[PDB]
A paper describes a structure:
Second, two protomers oligomerize via their trimeric noncollagenous (NC1) domains forming an NC1 hexamer at the junction, and four protomers oligomerize via the 7S domain forming a tetrameric structure. In protomer oligomerization, the interaction between trimeric NC1 domains is a chloride-dependent event.
Ultimately, it was crystallized in space group P41212 with a single polypeptide chain per asymmetric unit. The overall atomic structure is identical to the previously reported structures for human and bovine NC1 domains isolated from tissues. All C4–C4 linkers, native and artificial, are well-structured and are related by a pseudo-hexagonal symmetry. Analysis of the hexamer formed from sc121 NC1-trimers revealed a set of 12 Cl− ions at the trimer–trimer interface. Collectively, all 12 Cl− at the trimer–trimer interface have well-defined and comparable electron density and B-factor values in the range from 23 to 27 Å2, like atoms of nearby residues. Together, the 12 ions form a chloride ring at the hexamer interface. Analysis of the solvent-accessible surface of the trimer and the hexamer shows that group 1 chloride ions are solvent-accessible in the trimer only, but group 2 ions remain solvent-exposed in the assembled hexamer.
Author numbering:
A (entry chain A), B (entry chain A): 4 to 676
Amino acid sequence: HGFLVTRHSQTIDDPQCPSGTKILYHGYSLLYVQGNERAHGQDLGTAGSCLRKFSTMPFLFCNINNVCNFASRNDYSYWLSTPEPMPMSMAPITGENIRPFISRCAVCEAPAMVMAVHSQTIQIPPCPSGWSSLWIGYSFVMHTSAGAEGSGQALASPGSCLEEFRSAPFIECHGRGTCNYYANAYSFWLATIERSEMFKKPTPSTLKAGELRTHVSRCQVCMGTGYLLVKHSQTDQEPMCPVGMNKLWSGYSLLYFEGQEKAHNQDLGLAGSCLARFSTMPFLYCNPGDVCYYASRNDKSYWLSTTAPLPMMPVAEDEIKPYISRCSVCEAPAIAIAVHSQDVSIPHCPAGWRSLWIGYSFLMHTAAGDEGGGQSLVSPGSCLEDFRATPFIECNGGRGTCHYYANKYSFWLTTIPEQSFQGSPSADTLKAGLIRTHISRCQVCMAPGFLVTRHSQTIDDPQCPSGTKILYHGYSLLYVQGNERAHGQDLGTAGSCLRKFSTMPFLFCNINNVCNFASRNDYSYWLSTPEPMPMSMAPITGENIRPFISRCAVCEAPAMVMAVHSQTIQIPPCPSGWSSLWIGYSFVMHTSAGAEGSGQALASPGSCLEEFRSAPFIECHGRGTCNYYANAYSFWLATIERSEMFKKPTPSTLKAGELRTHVSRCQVCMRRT
Amino acid sequence: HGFLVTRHSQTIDDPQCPSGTKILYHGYSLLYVQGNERAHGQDLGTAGSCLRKFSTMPFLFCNINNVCNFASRNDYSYWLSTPEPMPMSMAPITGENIRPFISRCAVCEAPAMVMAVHSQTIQIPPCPSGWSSLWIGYSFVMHTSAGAEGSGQALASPGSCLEEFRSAPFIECHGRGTCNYYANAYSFWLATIERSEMFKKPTPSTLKAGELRTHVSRCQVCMGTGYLLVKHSQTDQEPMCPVGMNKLWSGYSLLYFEGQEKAHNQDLGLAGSCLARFSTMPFLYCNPGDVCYYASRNDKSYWLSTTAPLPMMPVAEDEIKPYISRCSVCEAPAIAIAVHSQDVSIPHCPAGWRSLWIGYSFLMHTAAGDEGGGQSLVSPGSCLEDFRATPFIECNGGRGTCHYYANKYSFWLTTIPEQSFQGSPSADTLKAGLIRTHISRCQVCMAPGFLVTRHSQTIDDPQCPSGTKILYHGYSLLYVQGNERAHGQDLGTAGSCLRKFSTMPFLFCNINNVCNFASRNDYSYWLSTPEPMPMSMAPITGENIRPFISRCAVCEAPAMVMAVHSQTIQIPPCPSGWSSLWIGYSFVMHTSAGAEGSGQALASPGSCLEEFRSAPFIECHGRGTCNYYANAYSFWLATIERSEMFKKPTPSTLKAGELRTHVSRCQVCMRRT
Ligand SMILES: [Cl-]
Ligand SMILES: [Cl-]
Ligand SMILES: [Cl-]
Ligand SMILES: [Cl-]
Ligand SMILES: [Cl-]
Ligand SMILES: [Cl-]
Ligand SMILES: [Cl-]
Ligand SMILES: [Cl-]
Ligand SMILES: [Cl-]
Ligand SMILES: [Cl-]
Ligand SMILES: [Cl-]
Ligand SMILES: [Cl-]
């Protein structure tokens, strides 16, 4: 069916594909990139973390004036690293001296899906019954470096299970060709939690060389038939698995971690959002000097919550339990997806598809600072059965307490009374019994196969590619920005294809159970068409917006689909056993207002746009206006010569007529069945 | 008395000192720097914006392991620029080709204080009666570039009045030696506002070459005897000036602007916080292509507010007026300062000092996103007569509406029952009649002369320097971090010298009139002593914190004091007419948790620390713990060879025994009287 597993050696040698899997290609271990000071990661369990060609600057950026710049500002790349020591000078490494520092990786095709399980103890967690073992490791969850930017791993992804513990598991590289370790490069790991300690104030620990792994959770990567379904009860009782679905485990509903004031979220539809053991501080962090700190600074955790009444002051220890939502992870015979109506009407499941539950369209959230995160709209995690203005609670780390604070926001897709296009939303403030008719509805449904999403980048619906069948058409949503926090929908997922357009397709709700729609200064971003910008350069409003918005198709596929990238001007061939759906250009990330943005998974078809555009997306506002602004940046994978991988990038500024000469090419492929 | 004015030519030629002033030195126009992705600006009206030696990397950073790195990561510097065109290649500029792009400046000594006034029309505002004119210009307020980081000008500073309008008034440089213009380099200007339009929804305008200056406010820089006192009524009536103080103007209480999701604040004790004409969008912005946008995106403004009752929905147009606090700017015979008690007791004014009012210690604020700002604790702007859990209102730009949202926080210095040292704060949640006894009190008092603040960086009180007299001693506060936003107290100001220490010297209050003290995950930062870090490297608690905290003295001076910096290993001589108070090392900025931080004004004695330390400050938490963490970074001005100013910086990594070889030296000087 085309499942993939990616393995990282954390040495200069290629890792072997785990028993029962077969090699597709090898590469270098890409952790994340940082462009215009915004980080965008690649999950280490996915093929996008494995790049065939290294470079300290593997991407470039383009502006709306059709000018692209390569290695010509101040951007970063980050790579998993080897045991190689820092040179005694502690000065940045350049050229071929970089090579001994970069981890290698393997992309392998598995016969069945692959996941990680975590013990939250020093013991190895066993694989689920009937699942086969691929490797064991240490629970790696997130990381931060320059600017305290960073990214993290999904806790059910193999990428959260590193086979070698390192206080310094990654190295920082710069567009100018330098790489080094820096004292603020932090690695975050799941900590060991005793069941008896779950609802006690954490005992802080400062750990040094020789005792570090004593507090690091262990993991095992496992392969098994079927798929995973995750349910969150939003109550203090574990949910029941649907009829016929064996339960793997129950736990506590984890929404996100905050380390160094940087959120790292778990998708509520994935098993990483269901943690078996609760703590107000379930992780620790290490600096590169082999010193780790558990519950010894000012970090926090966030959990989906129950209807337990708002406390007057923070709750401590065992008073926390009634507040924490519970979850169950279940073995499913097919992949569950969410469908959203953007309407008062509940959306029906497609004909023949088994329905699992009905809910409300939960999109994103913010709390302390402007940190937060959001859900994938094709994930069941975006469909909460119970609407709640405040669906999560904050747990303040080493304090051992949890509380509701006034800056907690939830964001929900809105109902839209128009059949499909809302260019001029009307602001409103909603309370009490007037809220729910403005919250989009959803249903979670079991799909018979797989989904491929395609974007025309024109006003015309795209055709479904060969071997796939249309499910629905819509508009190309790139990301949203709520309360100054950006949240994307991967362009390879059905969440980037919305049946209804609005310049403001969401609203937000506060601790006082008041919701505000199109009343503040929030944004939506959409892939756009070749429609020329107006000569006036003034914002576009209302019905005049329609010619600018790209259309999309969501299609049913008989097998899995992926993107591969050449990092050259040549088209990369599809892997053996895979056939071609389309070709395009390697699209990595983007920023716009406030330098916020999002990006694509490099193994996702969403990182392979069929039409190169220096300005591939348009910015819209709750005010009912859209425009192209001069700070809209698109980032693409750069072309790299194998012989020059480790040499200093040669900076280049490209103009119209030579843009696509330095843009990596890609192909989208589906496993032949 | 030693007043200074700084002028920027915006060309390659030295500007002339304005009539009635005399030249001290010339240099290059430094706008801001960015280190570890955090921006720190120098107000263009101050001598710290005028650096004798240019470099694309004029600073270095040091970590707690006594290792310093120069031009060896990925940092930035920004400079006011000339009319020089971009090269046709649009590729980064290097080497001597940079020189034609950098503005020159002059630092001049004035016989009296200097300010800017703004018309908010296309007409030149007249100088106040009895004030003499120095130059006229255009109202320049803030700017953003890479990462949408940036900084801005105080609206009563000459730095807010640029003599030449430019859509692209500054250029971006990098540690690697490159400089260029980028499409996201935004300049923000005060807009023209008709009195009849003040409380109407803004009319958006997209402006192109040939009509840009039609919407740009004009300004005049003026010199006059005496000082300025600013009062905010916190009501819809203008405050009366104190007896004997002539009123210059009345206006509306401006707290901050938000452009590109980056706050730029006005000090509530300075005349820039009193804007004569209100608008929900009082500024516009330009990109470097000579295209400007007024009320055409998603920016906002924030104002001090009244007791007008919380509206159920946003208020529009003329319903806004009852909500906006009013202000008056008054001519004062001496400089008013705030003194804070950190106690239930109201602090008395020093003997002989005229008292102006009594209030509560207002420290900082956050609202949309995590943006916000704060007050200087020696400024009367930190002493609000009326405590308010929500002392400001948000105005949503081009919507033309204002509202109170649930994520608005105010932060206040706390009362502390200990005589001077609180190492273990006890968390509490406060409501209704139990709040006010926990809010520090203040009094605003007219000082007979000037103030100099000195830090011992030891547990011993420093001596007041020659020619000054002790006023009080305290502890060295570097900055605070509330709701993930950092807010500093310049080390050359009395606000960095607090009579009482706490790991959590503040609390925050929410829209529901509930205050939370030491209950979440906030921070305070203090200059520290030579006390060794514990071998255990574990956090320090309670009374054990005392040996680590630096002491300070606030002293009365007969004249103004400044810092000068050599950018070499040699001590810079005091200017002619000025005598030496102490020598030290050029200290620019710092970051710690979350890569947040603050910095010093380079003309302030706070940028001249007498003891160089790679780890000059310690991090404390509301939990009652303090520690040195590996991501604590100190940034210092680097040494620069005049012949190599425009050449590529040579990167250097320095170890113990050679740290001070690349650290600029400074001297603190007082005008002889
Ligand atoms: Cl770069
Ligand atoms: Cl470092
Ligand atoms: Cl912690
Ligand atoms: Cl709160
Ligand atoms: Cl909005
Ligand atoms: Cl723009
Ligand atoms: Cl650098
Ligand atoms: Cl650009
Ligand atoms: Cl605007
Ligand atoms: Cl709100
Ligand atoms: Cl706290
Ligand atoms: Cl640390």
